[PDB]
Amino acid sequence: MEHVAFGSEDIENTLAKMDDGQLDGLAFGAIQLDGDGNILQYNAAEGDITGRDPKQVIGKNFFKDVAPCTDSPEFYGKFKEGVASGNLNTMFEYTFDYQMTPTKVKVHMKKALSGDSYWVFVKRV
Ligand SMILES: *C(=O)/C=C/c1ccc(O)cc1
């Protein structure tokens, strides 16, 4: 696979500029968002967790379109606050339940190293 653990302290360095192929080798779901929440990258593990087809969701807005169950203070609010501050590093459990069997996950959102983009990492719990 790719040898990176969920929640690693330097994950943003390890995944910096990772192409879509390499991202598909992670053991956990990985989504890269711009500051508005548009999907830039979406890996295979995430698609397995959620059922979404990665290439279909890239370019969509995660909060508006793909994941309305995350359009809440508890998820989007945290994301939006992090984007506004230009800093984000949070881990929390959540349940994904839009047009899918409800699935509890652990989420790690972390600002990407460079630029202004934001990772959403997901694993099952
Ligand atoms: C709630 O609507 C959650 C949906 C969802 C979460 C994560 C994804 O990668 C895709 C859909």
From Swiss-Prot:
Residues bearing the modification S-(4-hydroxycinnamyl)cysteine: C69
CDD domains to which the protein is assigned, alphabetical: PAS
Pfam families: PAS
PROSITE patterns: PAS
Residue ranges annotated for the PAS domain, each copy included: 23-86
Molecular function per GO: identical protein binding; photoreceptor activity
Keywords associated with the record: Chromophore, Photoreceptor protein, Receptor, Sensory transduction
UniProt modification remark: The 4-hydroxycinnamic acid (p-coumaric acid) chromophore is covalently bound via a thioester linkage.
Protein family according to the UniProt entry: Belongs to the photoactive yellow protein family.
Function: Photoactive blue light protein. Probably functions as a photoreceptor for a negative phototaxis response.
Protein name: Photoactive yellow protein
Gene source species: Halorhodospira halophila
